[PDB]
Amino acid sequence: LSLTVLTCIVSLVGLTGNAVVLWLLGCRMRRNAFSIYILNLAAADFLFLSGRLIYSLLKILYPVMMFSYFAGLSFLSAVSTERCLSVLWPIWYRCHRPTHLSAVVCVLLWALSLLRSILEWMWCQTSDFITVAWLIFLCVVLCGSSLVLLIRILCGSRTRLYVTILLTVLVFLLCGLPFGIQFFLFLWIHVDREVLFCHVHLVSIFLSALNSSANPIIYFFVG
């Protein structure tokens, strides 16, 4: 019905939170090899929520909204992968990685987002499955890195860790993923429709807004 009633509010708090992080970490803070990812995620969530809030009021904005969405998901996957790499190989991550590798990874992930967008800009349009495969690859990377991190702590060595990792995997899997997964997929094979605008559409659009709103507190405020 009017479920769009809070999809705009959930972004009126998330955006603010993202504006704080954008200028706290980044202004009064030293950036390590991990805060660059958080800063880029904050910028991407800034653009995504701004687009969501503008769209909620009821153009040519879709492109930037999708671009920010996929950039944010890719940055989440990169954060998970980099966190996994710091435990399997601690010596390499501490005294052998390039000091600018985080920025290089960030700019490559930025480039891969709009490239796909401009590729989509131009039966023949098989790019939808490619996008679905990209999303599946991102999800597989995130859960695989989280699993390897988790079976490395319990196995060996000598808490809040399990509690944080679980929550991190649960989000972006029940909150962030099922928007772009439902999109680009129910566009070419579905024949049903009421559902399409029942949970399929509101929940998808919302869950993504909630994920964007909650990410700054999971990655910068809780801790």
Binding site: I60, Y62, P63, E120, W121, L187, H190, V191, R193, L196, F197, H201
Partner: peptide, 11 residues
């Protein structure tokens, strides 16, 4: 294609 609503046509 024929079964796209307004929220299906991007550009």
């Amino acid at each position: 294609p024929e079964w796209w609503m307004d929220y299906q046509k991007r550009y």
